[PDB]
Amino acid sequence: MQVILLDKVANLGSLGDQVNVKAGYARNFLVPQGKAVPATKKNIEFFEARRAELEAKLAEVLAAANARAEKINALETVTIASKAGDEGKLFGSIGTRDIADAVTAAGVEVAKSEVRLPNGVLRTTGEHEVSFQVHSEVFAKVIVNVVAE
Amino acid sequence: SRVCQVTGKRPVTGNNRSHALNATKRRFLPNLHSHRFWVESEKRFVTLRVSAKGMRVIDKKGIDTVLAELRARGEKY
Amino acid sequence: AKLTKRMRVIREKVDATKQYDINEAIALLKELATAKFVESVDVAVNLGIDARKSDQNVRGATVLPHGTGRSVRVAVFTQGANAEAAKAAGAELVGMEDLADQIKKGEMNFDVVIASPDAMRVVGQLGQVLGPRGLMPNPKVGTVTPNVAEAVKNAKAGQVRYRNDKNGIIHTTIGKVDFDADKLKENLEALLVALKKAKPTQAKGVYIKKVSISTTMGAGVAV
RNA sequence: CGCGGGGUGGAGCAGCCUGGUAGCUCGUCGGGCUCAUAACCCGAAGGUCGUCGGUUCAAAUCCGGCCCCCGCAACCA
RNA sequence: CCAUAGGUUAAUGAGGCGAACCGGGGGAACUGAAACAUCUAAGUACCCCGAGGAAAAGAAAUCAACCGAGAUUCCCCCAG
RNA sequence: UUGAGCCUUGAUGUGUAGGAUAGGUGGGAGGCUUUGAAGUGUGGACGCCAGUCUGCAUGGAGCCGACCUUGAAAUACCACCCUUUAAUGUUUGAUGUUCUAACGUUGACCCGUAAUCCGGGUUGCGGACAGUGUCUGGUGGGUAGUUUGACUGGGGCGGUC
Q1: How many CB atoms lie within 10 A of CB C164?
Q2: Cα–Cα dist C133/C194, whole Å
Q3: Which chains contact B through at least 3 pairs of Cβ atoms less than 8 Å apart?
Q4: Strand E contacts in B 17-56 (CB under 7 A)
Q5: Burial level of C7, CB count in 10 A (0-12/13-18/19+)?
Q6: For the purposes of burial, counting CB atoms within 10 Å of the CB of C99, is it exposed (0-12), middle (13-18) or buried (19 or more)?
């Protein structure tokens, strides 16, 4: 499928250029997010004034700086521990629905945690690393509790 | 029978010619794989047998309409 | 800095990868020449086509509408009192069968040779030394005529010689950096037509595709 | 006959594909080491670089012809 | 679990026998070219699906040649 | 991590003798230059051992040629064009590794089922390849079809249109 680009999704592709993508992937990633669209060749002459010089005017203030010195300097153990017995086996991680859980409900939704692992998912017991959001693009790290008190 | 179940491919008779010209048979036959769909009107990964270039038509018709065409031709899947 | 004071100026002024319209850049080219000596504005065509095959060879001469600004020595082969009239009308030296010996010996100081048809017998065999130099008198351009006092004005009207080099290039002058940019553009137009009129008809690959205009100690731009 | 290579003193092979370029071993003629040879040491003689052209500042080398060798291909009615 | 695989109930149609013709999609062989290689044989046999006294087609995204025509079908012609 | 295709910018050209690092081609006694050149140290590298470069501190307008003499050919300074060579931007590769959405499983367990013939579920293991369907250039004495001139004290070599 030929599509016109709207977002920075290609290293040789630019706003208002035509690229060929498989339709199942275009309908999964590009079209519903307003990042590239079918046809649209008749509208591109306005994209520079309507989008390019609009996004670049926000990128003149957001953030106009490099690196943070708040909430981000530390490393310590957190109140989060892993559920496992004396065989040391986890039997597959339930991740975002168990890692911060305190009630283990069955009639209602268990709230999805916003934490991020450096390895994506947990697999084994012991002293693993986890992180949480401290700003719109910035995450702070901690290690899990193994004393289980 | 190898069926693509959306682009009309079926096992059918025909010629093969390039230059000679010899009576060599072709019998037009496609490639055959399977894909797993999700429709969220039932909690299953729905498996269907398929061939090349069918997903562009499963998008253009919608999966409901593609399974409705199989019933309209009496074709089991 | 490894680059000289004059050279650093033009490295900021042009870059070979960039797009330029020569309808504005031929006026900028007047400012890229940095030689203290007399500079030239030269057209370069990059080849090819084969550099050795004689069937694909391009070698000739042409008249430019504004010339090159270079004053030239022109030789005239004529007999009687018409020799002094041809001198005054444009010839810089007179030819005789004593000068034909210097021509057989390759010793020449002239950019054009003119002949009267009654005197052509002095040089009519000399194609094997005048021809590979672009100097041979030819009736198909009027450098052989009973009216040599007109042909000497056509010789000083501004002519150029061009031949392909083994490297895969051919260079030719289109004027001085003193010229108005529309005189340089009409000389560029004229030269590219003179090379087009010289097309080899059985050659494979590019002939006139890749063209640039450049300057003495300076830099150049693509057409 | 086509295409890419082979042919460089009597016998074998570098050099050619970058124009500044002729070499080496063995034969032959010197000798040397040995009573003496296959080998080993190192000088001298033999130059249409198969064979004929083309072009220049520069081809035995590049682009061709002619005769043989190595190896199988296409370019028509 | 929702479902699916499977199961139960009600209404509806077809199945085979063939005679000859016939529509829809595929389709030889032995010949002949005095071999044989594109071509012929041949859309004939033969196969799957389907049906009526006929079948089928049908209202120009077609012909025509400056004149104009204005669905399909069928016989004598067009034409060896 | 870069073998290759494309991009961009830096760097570069010394057999040897005779003074010299002449890349190639074409110009040229005046031309490079005062916000700039040398040189050898802490410490490195290239190699034809000839010399020379990156970095840095300096010292502070230079300097070459003619004559003499090398070579096809000059020796400042250069338009234009290669060679080699490291990075930059980018696509693509051989490999190592990581994720699992694709793929295999001639693994395991469950359900259909007091049926393991094979479909679905649960799940481990490997992982972007294989398998297949062909496009395409070969090979194929196996397969499928097929060709093989005449005159002749016997065809055989020989004569012959």
Answers
A1: 21
A2: 18
A3: A
A4: 20-23, 25, 42-44
A5: middle
A6: middle
Quick check: B56 and A1 CB within 8 A?
yes
Which of B58, B59, B61, B63 to mutate to test binding with chain A, by most A CBs within 10 Å of its CB? B59
Choose among B34, B27, B42: nearest CA to B5. Answer: B34
- Find tokens 């990633």 and name the residue: A29
Q: Which CATH class for the A69-148 domain? A: alpha beta
Give the full edge-to-edge strand order of the sheet including C74-77.
C93-95, C74-77, C112-115
Structure resolution in Å? 17.0
Picking from B13, B12, B1, B6, the residue whose alpha carbon sits closest to that of residue B50 is B6
**B5 conformational bin, left if phi > 0, alpha if psi -120 to 50, beta if neither:** left
In chain A, how long is the greatest CA-to-CA distance?
67
Amino acid residing at A110: V
**Closest listed residue to residue C45, CA positions, set C168, C199, C205, C161:** C168
Instruction: Quote the crossing angle between the two packed helices C82-89 and C148-155, to the nearest 10°.
Output: 30
Q: What are phi and psi of C113, to 5 degrees?
A: -125, 130
31-60 of B, contacting A, C-beta below 8 A: 55-56, 59
Query: Are B59 and A22 within 8 A, CB to CB?
Result: no
Contact by Cβ (8 Å): C161, C194? no
**Contacts with C176 (C-beta within 8 Å, 6 or more apart), sequence order:** C38, C39, C40, C41, C68, C69
After which residues does chain A show a gap where C to N exceeds 2.5 Å? none
Closest CA to A132 of A90, A69, A83, A75: A75
**Nearest residue on chain B to A21, alpha-carbon basis:** B56
The gap between A115 CA and F128 C1' (Å) is 30
Is the C-beta of residue B73 closer than 7 Å to nucleic acid chain E?
no
Experimental method, per PDB record: cryo-EM
Question: Distance from A37 to chain B by nearest Cα, in Å?
Answer: 15
Composition of chain A by helix, strand, coil, percent to 5: 20, 20, 60
Pairing mode of beta strands A77-81, A138-145: parallel
Residue type, A36: A
The CA-based angle C153-C154-C160, given to 5 degrees, is 125
Termini Cα distance of chain B: 12
Cis-peptide, bond into residue A63, ω within 30° of zero:
yes
What's the Cα-to-Cα distance from A112 to each of A83, A116, A123, rounded to whole Å? 17, 12, 19
